[PDB]
Structure 1
Amino acid sequence: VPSDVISQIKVQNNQISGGQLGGMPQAADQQLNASIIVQTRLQTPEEFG
């Protein structure tokens, strides 16, 4: 049904805030701090297909 197509497009073509490793507050003895990338908005037509 078109409703499920719209819902799936909304889910899969979505940007998700992935946070970051070792963010505040952090432990007292870690040296690594890097962002986490989960999902990005689709760009190409074959990506949508």
Structure 2
Amino acid sequence: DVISQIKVQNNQISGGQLGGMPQAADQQLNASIIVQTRLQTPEEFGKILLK
């Protein structure tokens, strides 16, 4: 359970782009989406939710 939770909560989820090819006409916004990033400090690791 600990290994699976670490794998789930220490991932590199690729959100994508808020408006990207093929985009709609008259589209005037383009930005990247950030969902998750890999943890960096033991304090963050110790806060992983097991249950």
Please list the CA deviations of residues 10-38 of structure 1 after superposition, one character each: whole Å capped at 9, or x if unmatched.
Answer: 00000101000111000011100000000
Instruction: Output the aligned Cα RMSD.
Output: 0.4
Q: Percent identity?
A: 100
- Count, aligned residues: 46
Q: Post-superposition, which runs of at least 4 consecutive aligned residues in structure 1 deviate over 4 A?
A: none
Which structure 1 segments of 5+ residues have no match? none
| TM-score, normalised via structure 1 length | 0.91
Greater RCO (Cα-Cα under 8 Å, separation 6 or more): 2
